[PDB]
Amino acid sequence: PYSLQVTLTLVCLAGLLMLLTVFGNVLVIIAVFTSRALKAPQNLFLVSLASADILVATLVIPFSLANEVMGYWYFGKAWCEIYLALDVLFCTSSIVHLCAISLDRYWSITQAIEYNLKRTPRRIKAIIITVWVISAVISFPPPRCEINQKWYVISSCIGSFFAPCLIMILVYVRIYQIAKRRTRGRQNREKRFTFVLAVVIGVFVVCWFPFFFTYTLTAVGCSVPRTLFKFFFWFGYCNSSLNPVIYTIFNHDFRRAFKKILC
Ligand SMILES: Cn1ccc2ccc(C3=CCCNC3)cc21
């Protein structure tokens, strides 16, 4: 199974991850509904994403720790089929939310004056209610608790990630082009948005991409170590802990609001 000494090392590596995922994603929620500066229609995208992150960290991580360190699935076919489907529903509801947050972050730059009148909270709510529906329609497409259909396994990874990745890298390379085109505030206005954009579009790729590449690489059947895949699995669940910080710390409004709650 494991070393026991390690088992306490793995559980403490997690647990802290859970506390960090339900500390940022909750600080975002207690911040949008609390500060009169974030009461924008566009700020509801960060509350549903935070809810999804808090849900993953406390509904799929506690049991992933169990399946991996214990070795067997203590439960059977009554929180295992629910766990393997609530994972694909809580991570595909974070990737697709990151895609939406970037599309509403790009239509308001390229279509700047026409989009505000089409940005009412009703539209934001109707987009949040659709991202969630699609996130759950990918999870449920109508003793080891390990994932077990090649044709579907691709459809879902490509729609769940490749698509949100390709439509979010483009929405950030056509925003970096627009913004640097405004410059043509002294050698740091650009040097800051080269980093504010690089972190935003790179933490995603360095957290989630390796897992999905390996999963479809094994979907085609190219061998990936049994280990060196467990790092990737846990790497994604650890990206939801950074998501609440990436989309909030680079914002002066959010930063001044956090100062009030934690003065
Ligand atoms: C097989 N598959 C298709 C889409 C999709 C989305 C997320 C995940 C997981 C996220 C972290 C580790 N557990 C699985 C798996 C997924």
| Domains recognised in the chain with CATH numbers | 5-261 (1.20.1070.10)
The dihedrals phi and psi of 239, each to the nearest 5 degrees, come to -80, -30
Listed in sequence order, the DSSP H helices in 119-224 are 121-139, 150-157, 163-183, 189-207, 209-220
Could you tell me if the CB of 237 is within 6 A of ligand 1? Answer: yes
User: Look-up: residue for tokens 């957290």?
Assistant: 207
> In this structure, are residues 214 and 229 in contact, taking their beta carbons and an 8 Å threshold?
yes
112-132 b/e (C-beta count within 10 Å ≥ 16 → b) = eeeeeeebeeeebeebbeebb
Nearest residue (CA) to ligand 1, atom 6: 88
Could you tell me if the CB of 96 is within 6 A of ligand 1? Answer: no
Could you tell me if the CB of 236 is within 6 A of ligand 1? Answer: yes
> In this structure, are residues 132 and 48 in contact, taking their beta carbons and an 8 Å threshold?
yes
- Cβ partners under 8 Å of residue 212, min gap 6: 157, 160, 161, 162
Q: Residue 101: is it exposed, middle or buried by C-beta count within 10 angstroms (0-12/13-18/19+)?
A: buried
CA-CA distance, 94 to 96, in Å (whole number)?
5
Give one DSSP letter per residue of 30-51, joined into a string.
HHHTT-TTS-SGGGGHHHHHHH
Nearest residue (CA) to ligand 1, atom 5: 88
What is the amino acid identity at position 196?
V
**Spacing, Cα 163 to ligand 1 middle (Å):** 14
CA-CA distance, 43 to 121, in Å (whole number)?
9
Resolution in units of Å: 3.3
What is the position in ligand 1's atom list of the atom closest to the CA of 60? Answer: 13
Could you tell me if the CB of 22 is within 6 A of ligand 1? Answer: no
> In this structure, are residues 91 and 240 in contact, taking their beta carbons and an 8 Å threshold?
yes
Listed residue (162, 174, 164) closest to 212, CA to CA: 162
Could you tell me if the CB of 87 is within 6 A of ligand 1? Answer: yes
Nearest residue (CA) to ligand 1, atom 4: 157
What is the amino acid identity at position 54?
I
Neighbours of 149 (CB within 10 A): 10
